[PDB]
Amino acid sequence: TLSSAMWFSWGVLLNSGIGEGAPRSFSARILGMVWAGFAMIIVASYTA
Amino acid sequence: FTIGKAIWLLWGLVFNNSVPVQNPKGTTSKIMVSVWAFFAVIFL
C-alpha cells in the first residue's frame, strides 16, 4: 500500500473522495486521523 | 462508459462531496480531478 496510500492522503488534503481503503491498524488509524485533522484545520484557517 | 458520468463526477468534485461518485478510472487523471477539487476548495 504505497501508491494507494499516498493517493488517499493527498486526496484527503483536498477533501476529495480519492482513496477508499481503511486503516489496517489502530496506529494507521490515528495517523491518518491526525493527518486529516491538520488538513481540514488548515483549510478552515485559510478560508477564514 | 465515462462520457455520461463525467459531468456528474466533475461537478460533484468542484461543488461538494455530498454524493458518492464512481471516480476511479484512469488513475493518472486523478491528478487532474484533484486540482479540480482544489478549484472547488478555493472557490467555495
mmCIF file of C-alpha atoms in Angstrom:
data_model
loop_
_atom_site.group_PDB
_atom_site.id
_atom_site.type_symbol
_atom_site.label_atom_id
_atom_site.label_comp_id
_atom_site.label_asym_id
_atom_site.label_seq_id
_atom_site.Cartn_x
_atom_site.Cartn_y
_atom_site.Cartn_z
ATOM 1 C CA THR A 1 0.000 0.000 0.000
ATOM 2 C CA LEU A 2 2.484 2.617 -1.227
ATOM 3 C CA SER A 3 0.740 4.301 -4.170
ATOM 4 C CA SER A 4 -2.851 3.930 -2.949
ATOM 5 C CA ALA A 5 -1.925 5.308 0.471
ATOM 6 C CA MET A 6 -0.256 8.453 -0.880
ATOM 7 C CA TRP A 7 -3.146 8.926 -3.310
ATOM 8 C CA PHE A 8 -5.659 8.669 -0.462
ATOM 9 C CA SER A 9 -3.705 11.044 1.785
ATOM 10 C CA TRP A 10 -3.216 13.643 -0.944
ATOM 11 C CA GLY A 11 -6.914 13.454 -1.828
ATOM 12 C CA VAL A 12 -7.747 13.927 1.858
ATOM 13 C CA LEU A 13 -5.571 17.041 1.728
ATOM 14 C CA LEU A 14 -8.150 18.327 -0.771
ATOM 15 C CA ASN A 15 -11.186 16.758 0.970
ATOM 16 C CA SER A 16 -11.744 14.572 -2.097
ATOM 17 C CA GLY A 17 -13.175 11.077 -2.369
ATOM 18 C CA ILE A 18 -9.841 9.679 -3.571
ATOM 19 C CA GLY A 19 -8.739 6.590 -1.669
ATOM 20 C CA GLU A 20 -11.289 4.128 -0.286
ATOM 21 C CA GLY A 21 -9.142 1.842 1.874
ATOM 22 C CA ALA A 22 -9.404 1.752 5.662
ATOM 23 C CA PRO A 23 -6.609 1.556 8.264
ATOM 24 C CA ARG A 24 -5.288 -1.938 8.969
ATOM 25 C CA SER A 25 -4.126 -0.997 12.484
ATOM 26 C CA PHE A 26 -5.185 1.496 15.140
ATOM 27 C CA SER A 27 -1.804 3.160 14.590
ATOM 28 C CA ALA A 28 -2.521 3.834 10.930
ATOM 29 C CA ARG A 29 -5.989 4.813 12.177
ATOM 30 C CA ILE A 30 -4.660 7.565 14.451
ATOM 31 C CA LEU A 31 -2.007 8.578 11.880
ATOM 32 C CA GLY A 32 -4.467 9.213 9.065
ATOM 33 C CA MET A 33 -6.794 10.676 11.688
ATOM 34 C CA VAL A 34 -4.357 13.399 12.735
ATOM 35 C CA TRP A 35 -3.346 13.933 9.104
ATOM 36 C CA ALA A 36 -6.944 14.665 8.103
ATOM 37 C CA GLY A 37 -7.340 16.791 11.219
ATOM 38 C CA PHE A 38 -4.458 19.027 10.228
ATOM 39 C CA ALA A 39 -5.701 19.063 6.625
ATOM 40 C CA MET A 40 -9.118 20.422 7.487
ATOM 41 C CA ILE A 41 -7.823 22.767 10.170
ATOM 42 C CA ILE A 42 -5.531 24.272 7.528
ATOM 43 C CA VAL A 43 -8.372 24.621 5.041
ATOM 44 C CA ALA A 44 -10.611 26.236 7.670
ATOM 45 C CA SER A 45 -7.775 28.594 8.677
ATOM 46 C CA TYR A 46 -7.368 29.628 5.021
ATOM 47 C CA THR A 47 -10.918 30.181 4.259
ATOM 48 C CA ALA A 48 -11.186 32.365 7.350
ATOM 49 C CA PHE B 1 -18.942 4.445 -20.043
ATOM 50 C CA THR B 2 -17.435 7.681 -18.713
ATOM 51 C CA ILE B 3 -18.750 10.252 -21.222
ATOM 52 C CA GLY B 4 -22.061 10.348 -19.340
ATOM 53 C CA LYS B 5 -20.953 10.141 -15.713
ATOM 54 C CA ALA B 6 -18.182 12.694 -16.319
ATOM 55 C CA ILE B 7 -20.432 15.722 -15.771
ATOM 56 C CA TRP B 8 -21.828 14.336 -12.510
ATOM 57 C CA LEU B 9 -18.395 13.324 -11.219
ATOM 58 C CA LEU B 10 -16.707 16.615 -12.096
ATOM 59 C CA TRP B 11 -19.448 18.891 -10.777
ATOM 60 C CA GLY B 12 -19.511 16.842 -7.583
ATOM 61 C CA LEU B 13 -15.767 17.440 -7.407
ATOM 62 C CA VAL B 14 -15.944 21.215 -7.932
ATOM 63 C CA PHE B 15 -19.086 21.611 -5.843
ATOM 64 C CA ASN B 16 -19.350 19.384 -2.750
ATOM 65 C CA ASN B 17 -18.629 15.763 -1.864
ATOM 66 C CA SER B 18 -22.230 15.091 -0.876
ATOM 67 C CA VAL B 19 -22.915 12.226 -3.323
ATOM 68 C CA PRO B 20 -20.589 9.234 -3.808
ATOM 69 C CA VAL B 21 -19.181 9.080 -7.328
ATOM 70 C CA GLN B 22 -17.571 6.313 -9.384
ATOM 71 C CA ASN B 23 -14.415 8.377 -9.775
ATOM 72 C CA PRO B 24 -11.543 5.832 -10.096
ATOM 73 C CA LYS B 25 -10.897 5.483 -13.835
ATOM 74 C CA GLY B 26 -7.574 6.180 -15.498
ATOM 75 C CA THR B 27 -5.620 6.734 -12.286
ATOM 76 C CA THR B 28 -3.345 9.277 -13.984
ATOM 77 C CA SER B 29 -6.310 11.650 -14.432
ATOM 78 C CA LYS B 30 -6.713 11.633 -10.642
ATOM 79 C CA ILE B 31 -4.169 14.474 -10.578
ATOM 80 C CA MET B 32 -6.456 16.497 -12.837
ATOM 81 C CA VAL B 33 -9.571 15.740 -10.809
ATOM 82 C CA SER B 34 -7.699 16.626 -7.614
ATOM 83 C CA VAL B 35 -6.647 20.033 -8.908
ATOM 84 C CA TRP B 36 -10.310 20.278 -9.944
ATOM 85 C CA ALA B 37 -11.173 19.730 -6.272
ATOM 86 C CA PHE B 38 -8.590 22.401 -5.428
ATOM 87 C CA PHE B 39 -10.537 24.824 -7.611
ATOM 88 C CA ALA B 40 -13.557 23.727 -5.581
ATOM 89 C CA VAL B 41 -11.963 24.333 -2.186
ATOM 90 C CA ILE B 42 -10.787 27.803 -3.157
ATOM 91 C CA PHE B 43 -13.991 28.863 -4.938
ATOM 92 C CA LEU B 44 -16.324 27.877 -2.108
#
